[PDB]
Design a protein around this ligand. Sequence first.
Ligand SMILES: NNC(=O)CSc1ccccc1F
Ligand SMILES: NNC(=O)CSc1ccccc1F
Lengths: 237, 300
Amino acid sequence: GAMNSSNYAELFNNDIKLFVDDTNVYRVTVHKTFEGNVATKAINGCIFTLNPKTGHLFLKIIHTSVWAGQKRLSQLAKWKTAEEVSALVRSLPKEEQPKQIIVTRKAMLDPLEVHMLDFPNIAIRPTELRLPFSAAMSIDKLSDVVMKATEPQMVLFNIYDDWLDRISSYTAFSRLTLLLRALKTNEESAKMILLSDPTITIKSYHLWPSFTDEQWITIESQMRDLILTEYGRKYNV
Amino acid sequence: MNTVPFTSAPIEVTIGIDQYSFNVKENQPFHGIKDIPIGHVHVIHFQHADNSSMRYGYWFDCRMGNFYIQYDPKDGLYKMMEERDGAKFENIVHNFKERQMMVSYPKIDEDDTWYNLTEFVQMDKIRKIVRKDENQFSYVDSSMTTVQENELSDPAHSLNYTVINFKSREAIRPGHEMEDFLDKSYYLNTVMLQGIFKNSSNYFGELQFAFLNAMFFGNYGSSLQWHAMIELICSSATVPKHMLDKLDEILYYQIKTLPEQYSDILLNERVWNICLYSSFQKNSLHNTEKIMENKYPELL
Ligand SMILES: NNC(=O)CSc1ccccc1F
Ligand SMILES: NNC(=O)CSc1ccccc1F
């Protein structure tokens, strides 16, 4: 059934699972036409498919050419997402295929179930969690590869960098979700927090800065403040 | 005009014959039903006074044999049987008819209701859904489950309706996933009509039979089948014009006949709102939409 606070540790057991987030698949800018009407212009998007135990992110880049001449693009985007996730599973060796796929939005359930009919033993599940994976396009290296794409492309990222050398996958996921919630709540503040000290760098093969354990505690504290801060600025508390 | 004679009525029971029903008191002078119209299937059905649990009954066609009802005190129900001795059966009915112990099938001349509800229903197809080959008539009751219900437990006592499942490999062509799920024409026209049913008459017959078992016996699996067969048509962008026109007539008479006070349990809000207001055929069911809106505007 649905994934929520009560069954949260299941994410870090040894049953292979993937989160699929489709938020950033179909991305548009809305603008005025010469005639004064409104039109959309698509920009490149991405499917965010994440193994929460290992940090493995399969970032399938959705190039704007896939929308050409198509109608009802918001609906098509869900089916394209399901087609690509199905293709990914089929590409994996049997022992690497997931036992469950958790979709972050319920409208993905029927498209994915239909595309996965050949895999009746893979459970397709929703979640009650409000996960901040939309903010993945605020990670600079991910945003850059999506926008530079000239064709459909799968790019591979470890979203936890080397954190699992020192922390558990529960703690890594909690750090990731805190960072992404902060980036989603106040991108500028969040990025200022992460990059304010020029001596902590981002390794070429990493997404996030090379903080010591002590520095991560401070960072995480600052991200929690921010999410409280903006929560007062928003609600006037 | 044919006759379903009764050896007796030892327990108090409400008897239905098609869309009609009457009460028979314990040991009251009852010997059966006469003047039954030839040319249609019929259903004779029963609800005991002391246990409204279990409505049950028999589908039959008097052209296929001489049928009678006798109460079995061991199994506790009214059973249909076939008398092979034509001479004895005709002779016994005549004596009961002379004693005015048989009630008259009470059909109004103007009234095509039963025809309209059974237009495509044939005994031969009923007997393939309800398997008991040694009898020419078919027993159904409120509790009998369907083959699809048994895939999600006694096979010999099941309703073998055609399984329809919108999220199945049968329904979805590889590489046409979105297309086939959002527009079920392939599944309706190629898989079901051309492939399984062979023609729309057999499809409508099963749809009508499912409705009648839902209405007369409160059979939940039959209600599921009826709605699935409606939804499969309404969710197809490409349906022959004659099938849509016939479906509108079929459903009109089903909604007209449905007892008002059973609508809450026999009508699925989602299917009907989807079929009449969202689906490809939302504008193709004028008669059905008008009777639904005037009789069950709450459901919508
Ligand atoms: N840079 N990554 C690898 O060379 C392989 S490990 C891996 C595999 C699948 C998705 C993400 C991953 F990081
Ligand atoms: N063992 N069964 C019979 O002796 C009854 S056969 C029958 C024939 C015609 C009219 C009504 C009937 F009940």
